[PDB]
Amino acid sequence: LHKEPATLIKAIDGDTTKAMYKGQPMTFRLLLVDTPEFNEKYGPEASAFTKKMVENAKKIEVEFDKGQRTDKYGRGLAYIYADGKMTNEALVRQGLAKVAYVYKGNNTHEQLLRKAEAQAKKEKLNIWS
Ligand SMILES: Cc1cn([C@H]2C[C@H](OP(=O)(O)O)[C@@H](COP(=O)(O)O)O2)c(=O)[nH]c1=O
Ligand SMILES: [Ca+2]
């Protein structure tokens, strides 16, 4: 897989963000994770975590997997990197997202993220507390 440029347009919630990609505005949904909705427990904390990560970065990058690049809603499906650090993994490692929506053919980083989840759950963090 390859990292490609994007620029933050606006934070949305723990697993979605609006970014400009190839010069067009898109809503991205993070691959392989599920954060709580803003109205659910840890929802606001997941939103805040992603917002800080993406806003504070000097650069963001999007990395598509081998399969579908957009979902049925027209959202981009990607791994999003903030100054080289993967937001999808960082959410899972903090217990602010579960590994989820693991579809065959768009699951390159599955095991990386499952390892992060096992660590979060061993540490009883957030959703696992
Ligand atoms: C993460 C991801 C979500 N989706 C779809 C499945 C879910 O459909 P439904 O809307 O019918 O439940 C929805 C979950 O997104 P949200 O967690 O953002 O609600 O997005 C994909 O199709 N591909 C994906 O990789
Ligand atoms: Ca969600």
PDB file of C-alpha atoms and ligand atoms in Angstrom:
ATOM      1  CA  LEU A   1       0.000   0.000   0.000  1.00  0.00           C
ATOM      2  CA  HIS A   2       0.997   3.668  -0.585  1.00  0.00           C
ATOM      3  CA  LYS A   3       0.511   6.855   1.450  1.00  0.00           C
ATOM      4  CA  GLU A   4      -0.997   9.720  -0.536  1.00  0.00           C
ATOM      5  CA  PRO A   5      -1.366  13.393   0.375  1.00  0.00           C
ATOM      6  CA  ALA A   6      -4.466  14.957   1.874  1.00  0.00           C
ATOM      7  CA  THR A   7      -5.295  18.044   3.904  1.00  0.00           C
ATOM      8  CA  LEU A   8      -7.607  18.271   6.791  1.00  0.00           C
ATOM      9  CA  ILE A   9     -10.832  20.180   6.051  1.00  0.00           C
ATOM     10  CA  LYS A  10     -12.609  19.439   9.332  1.00  0.00           C
ATOM     11  CA  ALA A  11     -12.767  16.885  12.066  1.00  0.00           C
ATOM     12  CA  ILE A  12     -16.090  14.999  12.344  1.00  0.00           C
ATOM     13  CA  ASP A  13     -16.017  12.181  14.896  1.00  0.00           C
ATOM     14  CA  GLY A  14     -13.810   9.334  16.138  1.00  0.00           C
ATOM     15  CA  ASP A  15     -13.741   7.388  12.811  1.00  0.00           C
ATOM     16  CA  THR A  16     -14.709   9.937  10.203  1.00  0.00           C
ATOM     17  CA  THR A  17     -13.016  13.121   9.042  1.00  0.00           C
ATOM     18  CA  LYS A  18     -13.353  15.492   6.148  1.00  0.00           C
ATOM     19  CA  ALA A  19     -10.226  15.939   4.065  1.00  0.00           C
ATOM     20  CA  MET A  20      -9.231  17.223   0.684  1.00  0.00           C
ATOM     21  CA  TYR A  21      -7.869  14.430  -1.552  1.00  0.00           C
ATOM     22  CA  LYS A  22      -6.701  15.009  -5.136  1.00  0.00           C
ATOM     23  CA  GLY A  23      -8.063  18.548  -4.633  1.00  0.00           C
ATOM     24  CA  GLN A  24     -11.641  17.449  -3.829  1.00  0.00           C
ATOM     25  CA  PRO A  25     -13.422  17.424  -0.491  1.00  0.00           C
ATOM     26  CA  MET A  26     -14.227  13.916   0.841  1.00  0.00           C
ATOM     27  CA  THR A  27     -15.519  12.359   3.979  1.00  0.00           C
ATOM     28  CA  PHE A  28     -13.179   9.507   5.014  1.00  0.00           C
ATOM     29  CA  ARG A  29     -14.248   6.570   7.125  1.00  0.00           C
ATOM     30  CA  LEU A  30     -11.376   4.809   8.849  1.00  0.00           C
ATOM     31  CA  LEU A  31     -10.835   1.205   7.789  1.00  0.00           C
ATOM     32  CA  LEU A  32     -11.112  -1.698  10.240  1.00  0.00           C
ATOM     33  CA  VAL A  33     -12.416   0.225  13.208  1.00  0.00           C
ATOM     34  CA  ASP A  34     -15.537   1.343  14.930  1.00  0.00           C
ATOM     35  CA  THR A  35     -15.614   4.218  17.417  1.00  0.00           C
ATOM     36  CA  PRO A  36     -18.713   4.876  19.553  1.00  0.00           C
ATOM     37  CA  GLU A  37     -21.102   7.525  18.171  1.00  0.00           C
ATOM     38  CA  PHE A  38     -20.795  10.991  19.758  1.00  0.00           C
ATOM     39  CA  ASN A  39     -23.979  10.303  21.801  1.00  0.00           C
ATOM     40  CA  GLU A  40     -22.568   6.988  23.200  1.00  0.00           C
ATOM     41  CA  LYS A  41     -20.102   6.245  26.019  1.00  0.00           C
ATOM     42  CA  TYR A  42     -16.507   7.128  24.959  1.00  0.00           C
ATOM     43  CA  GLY A  43     -17.982   8.753  21.854  1.00  0.00           C
ATOM     44  CA  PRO A  44     -16.886  12.214  22.821  1.00  0.00           C
ATOM     45  CA  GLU A  45     -13.421  10.947  23.925  1.00  0.00           C
ATOM     46  CA  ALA A  46     -12.917   9.126  20.562  1.00  0.00           C
ATOM     47  CA  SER A  47     -13.978  12.253  18.710  1.00  0.00           C
ATOM     48  CA  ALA A  48     -11.555  14.353  20.711  1.00  0.00           C
ATOM     49  CA  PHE A  49      -8.709  11.924  20.213  1.00  0.00           C
ATOM     50  CA  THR A  50      -9.017  11.835  16.435  1.00  0.00           C
ATOM     51  CA  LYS A  51      -9.600  15.626  16.231  1.00  0.00           C
ATOM     52  CA  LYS A  52      -6.397  16.335  18.167  1.00  0.00           C
ATOM     53  CA  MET A  53      -4.369  13.873  16.214  1.00  0.00           C
ATOM     54  CA  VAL A  54      -5.390  15.151  12.805  1.00  0.00           C
ATOM     55  CA  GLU A  55      -5.474  18.919  13.661  1.00  0.00           C
ATOM     56  CA  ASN A  56      -2.081  18.914  15.326  1.00  0.00           C
ATOM     57  CA  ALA A  57      -0.352  17.105  12.507  1.00  0.00           C
ATOM     58  CA  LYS A  58       1.993  18.897  10.155  1.00  0.00           C
ATOM     59  CA  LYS A  59       0.814  16.502   7.417  1.00  0.00           C
ATOM     60  CA  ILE A  60      -1.944  13.985   7.021  1.00  0.00           C
ATOM     61  CA  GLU A  61      -1.858  11.162   4.519  1.00  0.00           C
ATOM     62  CA  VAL A  62      -4.437   8.650   3.343  1.00  0.00           C
ATOM     63  CA  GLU A  63      -3.652   5.076   2.413  1.00  0.00           C
ATOM     64  CA  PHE A  64      -6.193   3.009   0.515  1.00  0.00           C
ATOM     65  CA  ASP A  65      -6.240  -0.766   0.789  1.00  0.00           C
ATOM     66  CA  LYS A  66      -6.400  -3.251  -2.136  1.00  0.00           C
ATOM     67  CA  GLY A  67     -10.189  -3.298  -2.455  1.00  0.00           C
ATOM     68  CA  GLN A  68     -13.083  -0.869  -2.331  1.00  0.00           C
ATOM     69  CA  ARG A  69     -11.947   2.760  -1.952  1.00  0.00           C
ATOM     70  CA  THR A  70     -15.382   4.152  -1.206  1.00  0.00           C
ATOM     71  CA  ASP A  71     -18.395   2.810   0.653  1.00  0.00           C
ATOM     72  CA  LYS A  72     -22.063   2.863  -0.319  1.00  0.00           C
ATOM     73  CA  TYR A  73     -22.359   6.380   1.172  1.00  0.00           C
ATOM     74  CA  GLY A  74     -19.485   7.775  -0.972  1.00  0.00           C
ATOM     75  CA  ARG A  75     -17.108   7.926   1.975  1.00  0.00           C
ATOM     76  CA  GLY A  76     -13.452   7.198   1.303  1.00  0.00           C
ATOM     77  CA  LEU A  77     -12.202   4.071   3.071  1.00  0.00           C
ATOM     78  CA  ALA A  78      -8.639   4.523   4.240  1.00  0.00           C
ATOM     79  CA  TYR A  79      -5.956   4.291   6.813  1.00  0.00           C
ATOM     80  CA  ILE A  80      -5.195   7.888   7.895  1.00  0.00           C
ATOM     81  CA  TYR A  81      -1.664   8.887   9.070  1.00  0.00           C
ATOM     82  CA  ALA A  82      -0.914  11.975  11.165  1.00  0.00           C
ATOM     83  CA  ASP A  83       2.803  12.796  10.821  1.00  0.00           C
ATOM     84  CA  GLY A  84       3.393   9.107  10.058  1.00  0.00           C
ATOM     85  CA  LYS A  85       1.329   7.689  12.949  1.00  0.00           C
ATOM     86  CA  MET A  86      -1.736   5.650  11.975  1.00  0.00           C
ATOM     87  CA  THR A  87      -4.919   7.094  13.531  1.00  0.00           C
ATOM     88  CA  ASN A  88      -6.790   3.760  13.051  1.00  0.00           C
ATOM     89  CA  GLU A  89      -4.186   1.884  15.139  1.00  0.00           C
ATOM     90  CA  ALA A  90      -3.825   4.647  17.717  1.00  0.00           C
ATOM     91  CA  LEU A  91      -7.570   4.674  18.433  1.00  0.00           C
ATOM     92  CA  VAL A  92      -7.630   0.889  18.905  1.00  0.00           C
ATOM     93  CA  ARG A  93      -4.490   1.005  21.109  1.00  0.00           C
ATOM     94  CA  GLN A  94      -6.163   3.480  23.380  1.00  0.00           C
ATOM     95  CA  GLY A  95      -9.361   1.537  23.729  1.00  0.00           C
ATOM     96  CA  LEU A  96     -11.345   4.198  21.918  1.00  0.00           C
ATOM     97  CA  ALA A  97     -12.278   1.942  18.910  1.00  0.00           C
ATOM     98  CA  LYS A  98     -12.881  -1.739  18.416  1.00  0.00           C
ATOM     99  CA  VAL A  99     -11.502  -3.655  15.489  1.00  0.00           C
ATOM    100  CA  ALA A 100     -14.586  -4.067  13.232  1.00  0.00           C
ATOM    101  CA  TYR A 101     -15.821  -4.115   9.673  1.00  0.00           C
ATOM    102  CA  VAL A 102     -13.026  -6.385   8.568  1.00  0.00           C
ATOM    103  CA  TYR A 103     -13.936  -7.206   4.957  1.00  0.00           C
ATOM    104  CA  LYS A 104     -11.827  -9.635   2.888  1.00  0.00           C
ATOM    105  CA  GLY A 105      -9.662  -7.807   0.424  1.00  0.00           C
ATOM    106  CA  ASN A 106      -9.563  -4.609   2.454  1.00  0.00           C
ATOM    107  CA  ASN A 107      -7.844  -5.922   5.534  1.00  0.00           C
ATOM    108  CA  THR A 108      -4.112  -5.392   5.102  1.00  0.00           C
ATOM    109  CA  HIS A 109      -3.635  -3.921   8.617  1.00  0.00           C
ATOM    110  CA  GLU A 110      -5.919  -6.308  10.478  1.00  0.00           C
ATOM    111  CA  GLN A 111      -3.366  -8.095  12.513  1.00  0.00           C
ATOM    112  CA  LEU A 112      -1.545  -4.917  13.458  1.00  0.00           C
ATOM    113  CA  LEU A 113      -4.812  -3.585  14.782  1.00  0.00           C
ATOM    114  CA  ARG A 114      -5.795  -6.800  16.562  1.00  0.00           C
ATOM    115  CA  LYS A 115      -2.548  -6.670  18.399  1.00  0.00           C
ATOM    116  CA  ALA A 116      -3.243  -3.102  19.505  1.00  0.00           C
ATOM    117  CA  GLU A 117      -6.706  -4.141  20.689  1.00  0.00           C
ATOM    118  CA  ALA A 118      -5.282  -7.044  22.748  1.00  0.00           C
ATOM    119  CA  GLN A 119      -2.958  -4.552  24.438  1.00  0.00           C
ATOM    120  CA  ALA A 120      -5.740  -2.054  25.151  1.00  0.00           C
ATOM    121  CA  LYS A 121      -7.894  -4.826  26.536  1.00  0.00           C
ATOM    122  CA  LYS A 122      -4.988  -6.214  28.747  1.00  0.00           C
ATOM    123  CA  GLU A 123      -4.599  -2.624  30.112  1.00  0.00           C
ATOM    124  CA  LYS A 124      -8.334  -2.247  30.626  1.00  0.00           C
ATOM    125  CA  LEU A 125      -8.387   1.071  28.733  1.00  0.00           C
ATOM    126  CA  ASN A 126     -11.515   3.061  28.111  1.00  0.00           C
ATOM    127  CA  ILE A 127     -14.037   0.797  26.266  1.00  0.00           C
ATOM    128  CA  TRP A 128     -12.323  -2.213  27.972  1.00  0.00           C
ATOM    129  CA  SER A 129     -12.463  -0.729  31.497  1.00  0.00           C
TER     130      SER A 129
HETATM  131  C1  LIG B   1     -15.726   0.780   7.837  1.00  0.00           C
HETATM  132  C2  LIG B   1     -16.640   0.376   6.710  1.00  0.00           C
HETATM  133  C3  LIG B   1     -17.977   0.703   6.829  1.00  0.00           C
HETATM  134  N1  LIG B   1     -18.815   0.365   5.859  1.00  0.00           N
HETATM  135  C4  LIG B   1     -20.273   0.565   6.018  1.00  0.00           C
HETATM  136  C5  LIG B   1     -20.928  -0.647   6.736  1.00  0.00           C
HETATM  137  C6  LIG B   1     -21.964   0.012   7.582  1.00  0.00           C
HETATM  138  O1  LIG B   1     -23.222   0.018   6.862  1.00  0.00           O
HETATM  139  P1  LIG B   1     -24.624   0.469   7.577  1.00  0.00           P
HETATM  140  O2  LIG B   1     -24.683   2.001   7.545  1.00  0.00           O
HETATM  141  O3  LIG B   1     -25.704  -0.132   6.721  1.00  0.00           O
HETATM  142  O4  LIG B   1     -24.595  -0.001   8.976  1.00  0.00           O
HETATM  143  C7  LIG B   1     -21.495   1.432   7.819  1.00  0.00           C
HETATM  144  C8  LIG B   1     -20.896   1.605   9.227  1.00  0.00           C
HETATM  145  O5  LIG B   1     -20.343   2.953   9.323  1.00  0.00           O
HETATM  146  P2  LIG B   1     -20.487   3.765  10.606  1.00  0.00           P
HETATM  147  O6  LIG B   1     -19.826   2.974  11.692  1.00  0.00           O
HETATM  148  O7  LIG B   1     -19.718   5.018  10.212  1.00  0.00           O
HETATM  149  O8  LIG B   1     -21.937   3.960  10.916  1.00  0.00           O
HETATM  150  O9  LIG B   1     -20.512   1.667   6.832  1.00  0.00           O
HETATM  151  C9  LIG B   1     -18.393  -0.272   4.734  1.00  0.00           C
HETATM  152  O10 LIG B   1     -19.206  -0.610   3.794  1.00  0.00           O
HETATM  153  N2  LIG B   1     -17.092  -0.538   4.517  1.00  0.00           N
HETATM  154  C10 LIG B   1     -16.187  -0.291   5.524  1.00  0.00           C
HETATM  155  O11 LIG B   1     -15.012  -0.620   5.382  1.00  0.00           O
HETATM  156 CA    CA B   2     -18.918   4.512  14.320  1.00  0.00          CA
END
